């Protein structure tokens, strides 16, 4: 590696943490000023931006990691708590906008149906039932020592992910893939129905496609690269005839994959907080 | 730091809190529609095809309305109008066959449409007492014959021509005569319209 | 017509597992906190329970914690006590006290009617002394009662109260918070006094005021009665 | 219908009044000898407050 | 005739003006900037608040909004005491009685229903249901126990008898909607506010009216007497209050500024008259001194329209209804 590029990654670092740190907690006050939530959507907006906060106290501890040359100034057991906290961050945050995409999709194709099936309660009880589910799934890497002692660097090897499981594979496929599809479906399904003709008011039918279209763009860029990259290096890494050149861009690409994932909690709190006209009145107010 | 009667108080004002959410929820997923007119409109075939203000309730495929029909509340409409925002929609009447001036009708619907309060709620024009317009005109500034086919279309044009908020406003409308169990689609479609539009917002989608 | 009916007496074995039932009947029984009040033979008054409106607040003494327990039968308006292991010291007549309790609100106010049980063989503490005063249907009867921690809370309430149980009948309300006097009591009884200090003052004495009176303390749980004070002539 | 109006405002007329001078001291007057007791005008400290916290 | 009629009222009117209040005034110290702060804010409803009444104990209040509830406030601590269901959800006025044993509640299903809050049974059950009218019902205040006036959209005030039901006398002198009443300290006056851009002195014990008040421009909706029991305060839709007067039958002075626009929807006094309250569409409430016109303070925190405004009996707090569901005791 260079200081220089490393200087980039640290400073896209900070101002990740920065836009983070300030969005989901400016969301979070929202929310909370708006606590009336007699829909099921204030819900998950809401854990989706609980995830994001503790999304943000993660990206500190790299920070310091990539601008200290490469080297851990920090305990075994931060090392192995990192860890923990970043697989589930990002799951909860995956879990949380592929129900964000359910519910849009049972309020817009199926209005009358679902008007017994959309109570504020269910909300609630589904999303704890996630979040134990994650937690249940992440608790193996919560006892699992990262200790890389070469010389002075233990390296936290379970930062950017390097080792290899296989049976960590074929679970984080077997959890990526059902997300994956439901959130493709769910908006493709939405863009038919608001596409075919309806006395809807036609600004608001092309605002709201529009805004379809940049939410799942968001979520097939800032997801897909790290879950193909992760697969196709691990199929392709432990297996014999593997280049220097070949390891170096392996662990440039899986650097950026998981940037690129880490982007998301920056990206998040704007698209479907600020955007949103359900509550830019008291935007502006707190102008 | 509470006595022992203040902590009973505060569970009893708890429970009064539950019971107020639980029934705020259940009254806000039904459909509420003013039902105006114009006197001999014909309100009582749309009220049974389904001293102070009326209320009816009905159900639809899982639906539950109520039309509201202030009707004989003969006092200042400016007064008492404003308690009606937010309504669903708004059930418009009038009868063709009585062109009891059908200006009255026009202003009438000129002052609902061209309102603050509702400026933003679709209005199920409905245009009942069909078939008596037609013997009529069969006998009885228009360019055109004396026949029921373009006439209605130009009573439509007149009547869809006074919303001056042309955009973002909907104003449905359908000809009836024989109750032939189709004006609960009607209704139930434009509700189905303007339920699409309010889960649009709400939804942050936009 | 509030009545409150009991069942569930009789002669129970040592150990057993007894349970008593009180159907209400002619008031709104779910918006009403109830007690299980009970009265030794020869003796005073002893608070035993509470499960409050909306169950889920439920207190017991102590004797008593772990082999009693309450339970309410909401829709059909049924009071329940489920005794286990059952000694020889628990036998005495039982009550079904209803209560209220909003700003303004008077507990206590009707009592139920009994049930004979006769089983085979840092609390705050009332005195009331000079019991069975003997006075003539003249006039001006003072009973006494005296507490341990002062009753005024710092709200500005004194959660003091007065029963009175004429011979043969049940409890009834006379005076609540220690000023306010309960419904359907005629204005001769008055109720007064200051921390730790109280005094019932009754005027212009008739015959149907001969009985016991009890003073009974609300400040915190567990409620603790009086001895009692019996009234002669 | 408009003869119970003729009586009404004859009625009217019948009345005698003050003058402005003297209700609009009667009227200061009174508000001045009621000033103290006023906790909307001149604010109470925060231990006689209810309502603080 | 009665053109001359009301032509020589002026004179006399005019006769008996020789000095406006401002000039005698002027030379009283201005009260100061008004520091009010709002110290608590009472949560419970779903929709639009549209009226409020104070206990007579200074702690209890009443708000009806159009979710069909009642609720009792125990206002020192946020309490709720009672949640009344209504058969009506078109409510437009509230009162509490003085002795505090029951409430009322009109509307636009023209019946005023009172309710008991102090029964054997446990509940608040719907003492009687008062018809008679025919319009919308305004304004209800209880006089005892066992009277109570009204004021309807049928353009009359009607005093009732509870026990009976009946009417015992009805008030007929207005040309439009009545929208207000209020009630003289003794109870023996009363004063009501229609849309004719007037307002009448009645008589309660023989029902005539006895002073017609005019000087406004729109429709009065809100009125107030002065404590003293000799005076006054009309609020209307010109953005203007007035303050008038009993005994001189003239209005006194005038609170008008040129930044208000929207009109006023409730007033109220201070225990020793000297503040004027006055609720506005502009969202947020006023403080006028009653006697140099001049403005003192401004009691901004509600997110829509104000609707109702009351000062406890012993003049200690105030309280304000919005269109967002939320009551807020200022003090």
Redesign the interface.
Same mark, same amino acid.
């Not at chain 2, 009973?8 to 004002?13: L, M």
């Given at each position: 590696e260079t200081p220089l590029e490393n200087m980039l990654f640290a400073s896209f670092y900070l101002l990740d943490f920065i836009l983070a740190l300030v969005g989901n907690t400016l969301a979070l006050w929202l929310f909370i000023r708006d606590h009336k939530s007699?829909?099921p959507?204030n819900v998950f #907006?809401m854990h989706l931006a609980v995830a994001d906060l503790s999304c943000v106290l993660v990206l500190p501890t790299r920070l310091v990691y990539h601008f200290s040359g490469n080297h851990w100034p920090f305990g075994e057991i931060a090392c192995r708590l990192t860890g923990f906290l970043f697989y589930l961050n990002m799951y909860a945050s995956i879990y949380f906008l592929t129900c964000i995409s359910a519910?849009?999709f049972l309020?817009?194709v199926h209005?009358?149906?679902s #008007?017994?099936l959309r109570?504020?309660l269910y909300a609630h009880l589904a999303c704890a039932f996630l979040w134990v589910v994650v937690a249940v799934a992440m608790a193996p890497l919560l006892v699992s020592p990262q200790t890389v002692q070469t010389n002075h660097t233990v390296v936290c090897l379970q930062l950017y992910r390097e080792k290899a499981s296989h049976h960590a594979l074929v679970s984080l496929a077997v959890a990526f893939t059902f997300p994956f599809i439901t959130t493709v479906t769910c908006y493709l399904l939405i863009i038919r129905s608001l596409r075919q003709g309806?006395?809807?008011?036609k600004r608001?039918k092309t605002?709201?496609v529009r805004?379809?279209a940049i939410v799942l763009a968001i979520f097939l860029v800032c997801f897909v690269p790290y879950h193909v990259n992760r697969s196709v290096y691990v199929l392709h890494y432990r297996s014999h005839g593997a280049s220097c050149a070949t390891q170096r861009i392996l662990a440039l690409a899986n650097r950026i994959t998981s940037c690129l994932t880490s982007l998301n909690g920056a990206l998040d709190p704007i698209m479907?907080f600020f955007?949103?006209?359900?509550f830019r009145h008291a935007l502006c107010n707190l102008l | 730091t509470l006595?022992?009667?203040?902590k *009973? *108080?505060?569970?009893?004002?708890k429970?009064?809190?539950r019971?107020?959410r639980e029934?705020?929820?259940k *009254? *806000?997923?039904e459909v509420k529609l003013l039902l105006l007119g114009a006197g001999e409109s014909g309100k009582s075939t749309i009220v049974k095809q389904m +001293?102070?203000?009326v209320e009816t309730h009905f159900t639809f495929?899982?639906?539950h309305f109520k039309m509201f029909d202030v009707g004989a509340?003969?006092?200042?409409r400016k007064?008492?109008i404003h308690?009606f925002e937010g309504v669903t929609a708004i059930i418009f009447c009038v009868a063709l066959s009585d062109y009891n001036r059908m200006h009255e009708s026009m202003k009438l619907f000129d002052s609902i449409c061209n309102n603050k309060w509702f400026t933003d709620t679709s209005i199920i024009l409905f245009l009942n007492k069909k078939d008596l317009f037609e013997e009529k005109i069969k006998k009885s500034e228009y360019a055109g014959s004396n026949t029921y086919e373009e006439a209605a279309a130009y009573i439509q044009c007149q009547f869809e021509d006074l919303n001056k908020r042309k955009? +973002?406003k909907?104003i449905?409308t359908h000809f009836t005569c024989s109750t032939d169990t189709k004006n609960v689609q009607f209704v139930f479609d434009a509700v +189905?319209?303007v339920?699409?539009?309010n889960?649009?917002?709400?939804?942050?989608?936009? | 017509d509030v009545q409150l009916v009991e069942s569930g007496g009789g002669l129970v074995q040592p150990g057993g597992s007894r349970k008593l039932s009180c159907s209400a009947s002619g008031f709104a029984f779910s918006?009403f906190?109830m007690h299980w009040v009970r009265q030794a033979p020869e003796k005073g008054l002893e608070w035993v329970a509470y499960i409050?409106?909306?169950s889920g607040?439920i207190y017991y003494a102590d004797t008593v914690k772990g082999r009693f327990t309450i339970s309410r039968d909401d829709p059909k308006n049924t009071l329940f006590l489920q005794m286990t292991s059952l000694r020889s010291e628990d036998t005495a007549m039982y009550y079904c006290v209803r209560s209220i309790? !909003? !700003?303004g609100s008077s507990?206590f106010d009707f009592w139920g009617q009994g049930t004979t049980l006769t089983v085979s063989s840092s609390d705050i503490v009332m005195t009331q002394a000079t019991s069975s005063v003997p006075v003539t249907p003249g006039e001006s009867v003072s009973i006494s009662c005296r507490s341990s921690k002062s009753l005024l809370?710092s709200?500005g309430?004194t !959660?003091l109260y007065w029963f009175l149980q004429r011979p043969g009948q049940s409890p009834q309300l006379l005076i609540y918070r220690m000023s306010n006097l309960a419904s359907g009591v005629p204005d001769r009884f008055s109720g007064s006094g200051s921390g730790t200090a109280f005094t019932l003052t009754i005027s212009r004495l008739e015959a149907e005021d001969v009985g016991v009176y009890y003073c009974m303390q609300?400040?915190? !749980?567990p409620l603790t009665f009086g001895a009692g004070t019996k009234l002669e002539l | 219908q408009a003869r119970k109006l003729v009586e009404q405002l004859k009625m009217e007329a019948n009345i005698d009044r003050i003058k402005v001078s003297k209700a609009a001291a009667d009227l200061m007057a009174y508000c001045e000898a009621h000033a103290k007791e006023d906790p909307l005008l001149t604010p109470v400290p925060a231990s006689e407050n209810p309502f603080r916290e | 005739e009665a053109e001359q009629l009301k032509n020589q009222i002026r004179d006399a009117r005019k006769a008996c003006a020789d000095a406006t209040l401002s000039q005698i005034t002027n030379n009283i110290d201005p009260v100061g900037r008004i520091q009010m702060r709002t110290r608590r804010t009472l949560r419970?409803h779903?929709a639009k608040i549209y009226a409020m009444h104070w206990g007579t104990d200074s702690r209890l209040l009443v708000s009806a909004s159009?979710?069909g509830?009642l609720?009792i406030w125990?206002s020192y601590?946020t309490?709720?005491?009672?949640?009344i269901p209504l058969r009506?959800s078109?409510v437009?006025t509230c009162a509490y009685a003085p002795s505090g044993n029951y409430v009322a509640c009109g509307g636009?299903?023209?019946?005023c229903s009172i309710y008991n809050l102090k029964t054997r049974e446990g509940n608040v059950r719907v003492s009687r249901e008062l018809?008679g009218h025919?319009?919308?019902l305004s304004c209800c205040r209880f006089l005892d126990d066992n009277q109570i006036v009204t004021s309807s959209?049928?353009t009359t005030c009607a005093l009732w008898d509870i026990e009976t039901g009946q009417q015992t006398t009805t008030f007929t002198g207005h040309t439009?909607?009545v929208?207000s009443l209020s009630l003289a300290p003794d109870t023996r006056l009363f004063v009501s506010g229609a849309?004719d851009a007037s307002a009448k002195l009645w008589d309660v014990r023989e029902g005539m009216c006895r002073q017609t008040f005019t000087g406004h421009e729109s429709?009065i909706n809100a009125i107030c007497f002065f404590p003293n029991g000799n005076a006054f305060a009309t609020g209307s839709d010109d953005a203007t209050c007035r303050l008038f007067d009993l005994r001189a039958d003239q209005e006194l002075m005038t609170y008008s500024h040129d930044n208000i626009i929207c009109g006023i929807t409730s007033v109220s006094f201070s225990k020793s008259g000297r503040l004027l309250l006055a609720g506005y569409d502009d969202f947020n409430c006023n403080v006028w001194d009653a006697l140099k016109a001049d403005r003192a303070g401004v009691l901004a925190g509600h997110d829509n329209r104000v609707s109702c405004l009351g000062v406890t009996d012993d003049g200690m707090a105030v309280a304000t209804g919005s269109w967002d569901s939320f009551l807020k005791i200022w003090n």
């Open positions: 007699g829909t959507a #907006l519910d849009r309020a817009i209005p009358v149906k #008007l017994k109570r504020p309806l006395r809807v008011e608001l605002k709201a805004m379809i479907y955007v949103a006209e359900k | 006595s022992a009667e203040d *009973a *108080a505060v569970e009893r004002s429970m009064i809190d019971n107020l029934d705020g929820e *009254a *806000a997923r +001293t102070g203000i495929k899982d639906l509340q003969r006092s200042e007064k008492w308690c955009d +973002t909907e449905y +189905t319209d339920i699409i539009k889960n649009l917002k709400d939804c942050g989608l936009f | 918006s906190g409050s409106s909306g607040t309790y !909003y !700003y507990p809370h709200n309430n !959660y609300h400040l915190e !749980y | - | 419970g779903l159009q979710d509830k609720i125990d601590t309490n709720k005491v009672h949640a009506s078109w437009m636009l299903d023209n019946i018809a025919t319009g919308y959209g049928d439009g909607d929208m849309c429709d």
